[PDB]
Amino acid sequence: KPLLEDKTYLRHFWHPVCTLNEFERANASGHGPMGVTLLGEKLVLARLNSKIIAAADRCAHRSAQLSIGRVCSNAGKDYLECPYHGWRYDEAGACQLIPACPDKSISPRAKISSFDCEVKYDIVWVRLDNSFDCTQIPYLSDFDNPDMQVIVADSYIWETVAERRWENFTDFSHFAFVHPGTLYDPFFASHPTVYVNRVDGELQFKLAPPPMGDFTYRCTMPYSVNLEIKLWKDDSRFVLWTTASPVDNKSCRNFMIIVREKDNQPDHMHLAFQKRVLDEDQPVIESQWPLEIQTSEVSVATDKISVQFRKWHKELSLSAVEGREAFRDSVLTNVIEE
Amino acid sequence: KPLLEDKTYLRHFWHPVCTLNEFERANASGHGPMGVTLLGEKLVLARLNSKIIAAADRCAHRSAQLSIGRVCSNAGKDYLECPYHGWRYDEAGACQLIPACPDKSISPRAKISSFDCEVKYDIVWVRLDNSFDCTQIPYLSDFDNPDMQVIVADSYIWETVAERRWENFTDFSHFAFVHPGTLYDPFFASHPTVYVNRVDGELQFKLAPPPMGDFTYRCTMPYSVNLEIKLWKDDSRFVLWTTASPVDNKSCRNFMIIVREKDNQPDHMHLAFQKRVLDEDQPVIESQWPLEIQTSEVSVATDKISVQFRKWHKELSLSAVEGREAFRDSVLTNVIEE
Amino acid sequence: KPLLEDKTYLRHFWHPVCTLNEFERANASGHGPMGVTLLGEKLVLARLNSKIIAAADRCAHRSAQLSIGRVCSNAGKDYLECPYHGWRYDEAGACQLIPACPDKSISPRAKISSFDCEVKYDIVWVRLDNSFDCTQIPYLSDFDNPDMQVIVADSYIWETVAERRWENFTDFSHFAFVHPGTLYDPFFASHPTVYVNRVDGELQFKLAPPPMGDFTYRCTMPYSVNLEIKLWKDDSRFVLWTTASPVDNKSCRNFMIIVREKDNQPDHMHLAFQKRVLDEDQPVIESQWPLEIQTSEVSVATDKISVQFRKWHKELSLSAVEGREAFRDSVLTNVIEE
Amino acid sequence: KPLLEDKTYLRHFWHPVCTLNEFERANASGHGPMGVTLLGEKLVLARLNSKIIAAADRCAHRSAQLSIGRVCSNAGKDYLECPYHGWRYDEAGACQLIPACPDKSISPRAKISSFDCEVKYDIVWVRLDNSFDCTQIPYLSDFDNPDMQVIVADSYIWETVAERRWENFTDFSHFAFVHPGTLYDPFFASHPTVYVNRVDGELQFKLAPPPMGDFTYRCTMPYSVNLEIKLWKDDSRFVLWTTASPVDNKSCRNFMIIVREKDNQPDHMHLAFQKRVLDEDQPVIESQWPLEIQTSEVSVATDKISVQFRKWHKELSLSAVEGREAFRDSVLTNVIEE
Amino acid sequence: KPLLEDKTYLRHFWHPVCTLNEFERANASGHGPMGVTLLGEKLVLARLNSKIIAAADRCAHRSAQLSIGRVCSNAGKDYLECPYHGWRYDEAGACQLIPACPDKSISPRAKISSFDCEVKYDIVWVRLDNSFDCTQIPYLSDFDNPDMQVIVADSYIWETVAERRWENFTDFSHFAFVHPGTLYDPFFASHPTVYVNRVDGELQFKLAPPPMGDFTYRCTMPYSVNLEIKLWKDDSRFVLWTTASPVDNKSCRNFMIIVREKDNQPDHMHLAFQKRVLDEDQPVIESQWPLEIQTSEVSVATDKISVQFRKWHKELSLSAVEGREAFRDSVLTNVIEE
Amino acid sequence: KPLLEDKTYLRHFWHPVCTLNEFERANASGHGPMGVTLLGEKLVLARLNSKIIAAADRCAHRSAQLSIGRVCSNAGKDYLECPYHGWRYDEAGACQLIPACPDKSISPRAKISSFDCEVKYDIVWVRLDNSFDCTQIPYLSDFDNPDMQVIVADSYIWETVAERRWENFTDFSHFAFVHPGTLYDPFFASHPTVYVNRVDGELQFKLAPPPMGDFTYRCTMPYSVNLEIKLWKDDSRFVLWTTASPVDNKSCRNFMIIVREKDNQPDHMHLAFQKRVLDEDQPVIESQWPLEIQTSEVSVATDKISVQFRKWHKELSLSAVEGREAFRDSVLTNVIEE
Ligand code: FES
Ligand code: FES
Ligand code: FES
Ligand code: FES
Ligand code: FES
Numbered sequence A, B, C, D, E, F: 001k002p003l004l005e006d007k008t009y010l011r012h013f014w015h016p017v018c019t020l021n022e023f024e025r026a027n028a029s030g031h032g033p034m035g036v037t038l039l040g041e042k043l044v045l046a047r048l049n050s051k052i053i054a055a056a057d058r059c060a061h062r063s064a065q066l067s068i069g070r071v072c073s074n075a076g077k078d079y080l081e082c083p084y085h086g087w088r089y090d091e092a093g094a095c096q097l098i099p100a101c102p103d104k105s106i107s108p109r110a111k112i113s114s115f116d117c118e119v120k121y122d123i124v125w126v127r128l129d130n131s132f133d134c135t136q137i138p139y140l141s142d143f144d145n146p147d148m149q150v151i152v153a154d155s156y157i158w159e160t161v162a163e164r165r166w167e168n169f170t171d172f173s174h175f176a177f178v179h180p181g182t183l184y185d186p187f188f189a190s191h192p193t194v195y196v197n198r199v200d201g202e203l204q205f206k207l208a209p210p211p212m213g214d215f216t217y218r219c220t221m222p223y224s225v226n227l228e229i230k231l232w233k234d235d236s237r238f239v240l241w242t243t244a245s246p247v248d249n250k251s252c253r254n255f256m257i258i259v260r261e262k263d264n265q266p267d268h269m270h271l272a273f274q275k276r277v278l279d280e281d282q283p284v285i286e287s288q289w290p291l292e293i294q295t296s297e298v299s300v301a302t303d304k305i306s307v308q309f310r311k312w313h314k315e316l317s318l319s320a321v322e323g324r325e326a327f328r329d330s331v332l333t334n335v336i337e338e
Helices: A008-012 A020-025 A162-169 A267-286 A301-322 A324-332 B008-012 B020-025 B162-169 B267-286 B301-322 B324-332 C008-012 C020-025 C162-169 C267-286 C301-322 C324-332 D008-012 D020-025 D162-169 D267-286 D301-322 D324-332 E008-012 E020-025 E162-169 E267-286 E301-322 E324-332 F008-012 F020-025 F162-169 F267-286 F301-322 F324-332
Strands: A014-019 A034-038 A041-048 A051-056 A070-074 A077-081 A095-097 A114-120 A123-127 A148-152 A156-158 A196-199 A202-207 A213-220 A224-231 A237-248 A251-261 B014-019 B034-038 B041-048 B051-056 B070-074 B077-081 B095-097 B114-120 B123-127 B148-152 B156-158 B196-199 B202-207 B213-220 B224-231 B237-248 B251-261 C014-019 C034-038 C041-048 C051-056 C070-074 C077-081 C095-097 C114-120 C123-127 C148-152 C156-158 C196-199 C202-207 C213-220 C224-231 C237-248 C251-261 D014-019 D034-038 D041-048 D051-056 D070-074 D077-081 D095-097 D114-120 D123-127 D148-152 D156-158 D196-199 D202-207 D213-220 D224-231 D237-248 D251-261 E014-019 E034-038 E041-048 E051-056 E070-074 E077-081 E095-097 E114-120 E123-127 E148-152 E156-158 E196-199 E202-207 E213-220 E224-231 E237-248 E251-261 F014-019 F034-038 F041-048 F051-056 F070-074 F077-081 F095-097 F114-120 F123-127 F148-152 F156-158 F196-199 F202-207 F213-220 F224-231 F237-248 F251-261
Touching: A008 A301, A014 A020, A014 A034, A014 A041, A014 A237, A014 A251, A020 A123, A020 E267, A034 A237, A041 A070, A041 A077, A051 A123, A148 A267, A156 A267, A162 A224, A162 A237, A162 A251, A162 A267, A162 A301, A196 A301, A202 A301, A251 A267, A267 E020, A301 A324, B008 B301, B014 B020, B014 B034, B014 B041, B014 B237, B014 B251, B020 B123, B020 D267, B034 B237, B041 B070, B041 B077, B051 B123, B148 B267, B156 B267, B162 B224, B162 B237, B162 B251, B162 B267, B162 B301, B196 B301, B202 B301, B251 B267, B267 D020, B301 B324, C008 C301, C014 C020, C014 C034, C014 C041, C014 C237, C014 C251, C020 C123, C020 F267, C034 C237, C041 C070, C041 C077, C051 C123, C148 C267, C156 C267, C162 C224, C162 C237, C162 C251, C162 C267, C162 C301, C196 C301, C202 C301, C251 C267, C267 F020, C301 C324, D008 D301, D014 D020, D014 D034, D014 D041, D014 D237, D014 D251, D020 D123, D034 D237, D041 D070, D041 D077, D051 D123, D148 D267, D156 D267, D162 D224, D162 D237, D162 D251, D162 D267, D162 D301, D196 D301, D202 D301, D251 D267, D301 D324, E008 E301, E014 E020, E014 E034, E014 E041, E014 E237, E014 E251, E020 E123, E034 E237, E041 E070, E041 E077, E051 E123, E148 E267, E156 E267, E162 E224, E162 E237, E162 E251, E162 E267, E162 E301, E196 E301, E202 E301, E251 E267, E301 E324, F008 F301, F014 F020, F014 F034, F014 F041, F014 F237, F014 F251, F020 F123, F034 F237, F041 F070, F041 F077, F051 F123, F148 F267, F156 F267, F162 F224, F162 F237, F162 F251, F162 F267, F162 F301, F196 F301, F202 F301, F251 F267, F301 F324
Parallel strands: none
Antiparallel strands: A014 A123, A034 A041, A041 A051, A051 A114, A070 A077, A114 A123, A148 A251, A156 A251, A196 A202, A202 A213, A213 A224, A224 A237, A237 A251, B014 B123, B034 B041, B041 B051, B051 B114, B070 B077, B114 B123, B148 B251, B156 B251, B196 B202, B202 B213, B213 B224, B224 B237, B237 B251, C014 C123, C034 C041, C041 C051, C051 C114, C070 C077, C114 C123, C148 C251, C156 C251, C196 C202, C202 C213, C213 C224, C224 C237, C237 C251, D014 D123, D034 D041, D041 D051, D051 D114, D070 D077, D114 D123, D148 D251, D156 D251, D196 D202, D202 D213, D213 D224, D224 D237, D237 D251, E014 E123, E034 E041, E041 E051, E051 E114, E070 E077, E114 E123, E148 E251, E156 E251, E196 E202, E202 E213, E213 E224, E224 E237, E237 E251, F014 F123, F034 F041, F041 F051, F051 F114, F070 F077, F114 F123, F148 F251, F156 F251, F196 F202, F202 F213, F213 F224, F224 F237, F237 F251
């Protein structure tokens, strides 16, 4: 009974797999190799010649995990060396040395899948499928704004799927029950008028109450949220950002970024407050079952954001099965409520 | 190769899900909500307006577990409140308040399955399916006999199916091997004459040896045993009762009740002795594999009780698939050996 | 995508299930019963009348595990007694006493499968299927050579399949990467000429470098290796032997034997060195995925041994499905490279 | 720097060592033997001929712990049997059988200290020293009041000394900081007029605010509190009682009893609420150091109860060192504030 | 048999108690309060009005730990609030509010010891005793050098005393045995000429071999090391700094800082390499017993640094017992070898 | 209140510190070094030039534990190398190389205590003090008897002192209570006539009942027992031997040897039976308190062996304090009962 039966669409989006700090801590070299799991796939990350690559975590020779091998160099070029019989892979996933027969000549069969991989906002992003060429790395505002300061949090795992995490983050009606002593609900028992737009691959909506502020959401699909809070009294802004990464069928790894105006307060005060909130949501959201969004779930008027999110996920899931042009239309066609 | 392929029949019987004490200890309120699993189904128990209800542990809105919510009251009526967005359910499983849009009007889709649920012998019983209206809560003797005193034991889990637990409880031929230093076998190497009757939904049989006593069994199907021990010298009686609850495909939760004549002895002496016996049976019974009763198992003459138990289970399993009248006939038709 | 889809062939070979010491330590009696798992089957070992038998670990009466029962004797004959209702089994798996009705007469249905089982080199070997009568217990050299001394190591589990363990043991090209500070590679970047023969159920090959020695392999199929190391300077020999037992679809239990010329050195020095090597291989080999050999794996010239191993495994797997004569031909037909 | 340097006085009071239920659960017999520690002394409890005795947990023969032996009977008399060589002790601590030389005659040296021991309010009380004959078992009200119902809680350990636990229980000024979301402070920033009397071995005081109620304390020395709460609106009463047992120099074992008017509410609701309060106090009180009351601690006006408690403890500590008449005067002399 | 019997001298030096990051992570507020132990004393750290204070972790009222209370504010001034009855302390350790009697007037007895406390190099330093006014916060070079970048490592505990940690850090003769595969020894079997000076409270010495570099040590007493490594080929410098904090009689908490020229390498590569070295030293140094430096230890010529360190520690230990002028002379008198 | 206040005497006896197998397993080399504790002293064992030495586990340079260093060789001579700065010790405890200044000349201060150490019965024995030259390695019979076979068990720790272990091993009156279902008592309620002799450093006594056998004890002081069991029917003998090693003030390490006539039974059957007995004694003996033998313990007639054991221990303890001749007289003077 799940809404989103086919997951092929998710392969065409950029997903975060770890923070840059997490990547550099994964191996004593500071350059990997490191193992991550994305959409059920086991990937290896390694920094070769100052660029982080993402490849299949599976040597073509005898299937050892490259993520427990080592980054090594020859003639000023870096390679990912297998831990087992030492085959070396370059940034494109081509095996450039078989040490057992080094003269050579290396079969084209000796090659692993190499994937789109870029560092942005001090997070490592991977896109498994290039074919449809219409997705970009999720939007975050003010990372480079010199009036503000950034916290890139360590990532955290929830035992639910990424859709449940996104719908939790964009919902206010649960504050009275999940967050009663922690978060004030500025809309309780209200039905604010909220227009939901699709603009350039993003869900965009704005919430205003009837200290008070506005809530402006830019949400790169399928799993990101950029929440701009603008205070009414004064023009001070606060950005809370999260993206859920679809690790596998039962978990997601979540990346939080806090952007705030410079203040001489300890960063840990802001991180610990968000952790306190996260720890209130976590057991409620992990109790939701089945994990996958189900068609039988009952939506009411205040679930407009969630309904629009589910609608676009379903359409994207179907469009990707249809082919390149269907998908690109679904991603790129703007839809302004009116 | 299992004897009892279809489990639909089990839904029509009353099964114990927890003791009353267990239910009251599950939540600081003393009124739940509490989670239990019955026949693979996740249920929530809560005490609303002095009655314990059993419902599906799954909110209709976004599938959160109601069993981690709270019992709350409005205008003197109790409700089961979801932990996530606060929908309130009444004793019938109808949602009576959506706090996001409270004026209202609540869709009929906003409703969870509510099940038969009654407290008897300080145990909580649930029946998942009403349709065939021919089963009752298992028989226990002397709970209200003012000459005797009762112990309702905490329940315990065995990693086997409920049929294996029942056949273990009604068998004497294993005493010499499982219980040699603990229980005397009054029938060893004997073949006592035992008549097995079906009477009003119960297996009934009596065992007599050739301090000594008689063993009178009334066994409400599918998983209860009421064992009356009447001593020969004197007319003193002792009741040992158990029911196995079919939690899921690999475990059962077992409920023991001891009824004895008042004696000024500590209850713990009787409980600890039964635990000692249980701990001798447990690893032998949990070693039985496959867990499910298999058709290839070899029965001999002394397995008459077990064979009659398996026969009636198989007939009940088939009758329930056939329909209401077939099932009611199988449950209700008495069969006296002769 | 696995190379070896059908596993029926493995049933026709002798596999080690435990060392003799392991068997004697499994039960306070020193005679079992003991539980082992072979090819996914649960077996019971017990020593009855001075011979270790192997049978199905499943009583025919009510399916209790015989491996938690006891070896008992009646009239000078030993029996395997079930822990539950005491049925006694003889060395052939026939039930010889039902204590509930002992006079008697025991049904032929009351019988468990009994398997080939022999102790050799202080290891317990089992063969599940007799039908094709063409396999023998793997070859080990010098167990009885009075100039040498033997270590039969405790067995160890790796979380991989037995083929991966065998290919690891017969490969030198991984030394530079897995064993750099522990084992010298006598062939690095060389392509020694290696002839691989099939002789009397064994893969046989010899490796010579261009202290130095020769490496002479006799490898009883499907999973044994007898490695004779003969030093060039002097004629001193050292035997390293291993057999991988196919426990189940995700693990193998490995048996090592070291045979060396008598030396007044502590055996633990030799065992600990081999453990150090094993601990270097273990995480690399356990990283290989999928566990099962896959057809897509890329073999190069230096994998000749592994390729010949995979070839004969595939042929054996197909021959066994074809029937007795096909299998016997595959096992017994010698093939000398030329 | 501790206030109460000498602890001899504590030996002359009755202290609770376990609940009756705890005693009956300690051994499968329901009659002990059981081990407890009181004032650093290791004691054995056993029920012999329907009376629980307390003795030194140390056999006179070779110093084995009697608390791991067994209660046994001979000629209708119960004995405490040593686990080692079987010496039997009667209720007075006299050895009545040496099984190695049973004819006999038992030395008077073969004898263990036996102590005052009585069950009251379903709690086991022990008094180590009889000599001064002026102390009684602490006061609890309404245990036998048929309009009310009693909960005797399982005991709990805090890692502090018993004086700290008592002063915590009789203090309201910590509610705003330790219990802000749990307990309302009816006296915050007030200085109610409180008269503290010494009456018949008890500290007695009453607190009234300026639902509301009165707080009437009768506090048997050295470590008990009986708190009667009488509501203003209506005459309904609620009794909260606790006694701290001085286990050793770093811990106390605490006994709580709740007495309330009959109400058809689950007992667990009242127990769980008190546990919630206890869990707020526990880490704050366990942080107090040094554990022992120190002379340098700074008392203010609102510590009147604590100051009077410390005064009488110090006087009792000195009186006991002085002798029988000094102690009896300190215990028994009433002192009414005026 | 210990060299340094009297520890009073250590109270007069600045010791690091935690990194700034560690302090800010200790409490969700980012401002403490936090608990640390220095020279056996329990201290509380809290940030009040933008300055971190250090005080005795013991409320004057009833001895609760202030480190589990909270930083609170009144009328724009911050206070350290006790968790128990809410007494508030200012930066000088004076109690400024007793909430039970707030009008007021607070006794001078209501006061806790307040200690010297300053943040330098992103580390929190405490000096317990001011009296002799001749010590300063240890020397570290290049923290503010804009051509270089700094790593302030998390602190780590070793189960040894701080003298053993210092002597380990300033010694090269152990490299061949503790660090054979990790650190090259530039002086092995050499006796370089090393002059050891006392200059302004520092041990100063320089080591030169006969890539290569010079080793210039400035070592603020009693437990700091600033190691400047200047490469011969090129003038590039690398600073490795450590200070051992005397936590108690059996452990020290160690603070490492790495200063290096900017390089676009990941900081984790440098941290992980130092951890690898630390993990080689740790079990050897923790094996040294007795922990305290003993007079019987045998020094050879290559222990010149250690001998001079022990000499000055012994003299400082004696001078502090003698009085202010003796100590100030020992700390401040320069001694140039010649 | 302990009987044996002074422990100096124990230093003059040979004590077992580990089995030979235990020593060879302690380090991958098979030659140590290994750490043991004897009479509170930390010792290092290492095999140098085919002989195991015992020395103080404390390097003279900077007090590192030699037991975590390594056995190394130079010019065909073995040395114990310190893990810290590499000082090498020979079999006499003299430092023969300081690698920092190797030319040399090594101070006589650079030397560790070296102790008597010999392997006998595949056990490592150490004697800390030579001075009185009158003790030998405990007696065990039949180790070299070619009609019998030996089991040298792994050693085991009990949390009691060695005297309690010895008295437990030589006592039959506890069988009925500690071993009721495991060991038959051949003397229950009997007072067999037992003569206790002191012969050549041994307690010697023989016990005969009124399958049956004689029990002949030769007990080398202070802690060994050689029990010869000779069956009446037939002349078959069975030797059970144990020695308790005084590890420290709260524990002993116990060495068991079983010698039996050759029988084709598994050794594990005999070991497991003795472990079953040991596990019955262990919690009773560990309950004995105070651990040290106390003067107040009450001995009866059947404790004759224990009383004679305590007498000779007390005399030995006093004699050793008196001097060489007193001790030698106490050890060597035979005393035949008559
Ligand atoms: S598995 Fe990677 S080189 Fe062989
Ligand atoms: S999931 Fe229950 S109210 Fe939303
Ligand atoms: S120690 Fe109690 S009978 Fe011997
Ligand atoms: S202990 Fe700190 S306010 Fe009372
Ligand atoms: S401590 Fe042993 S060589 Fe320095």
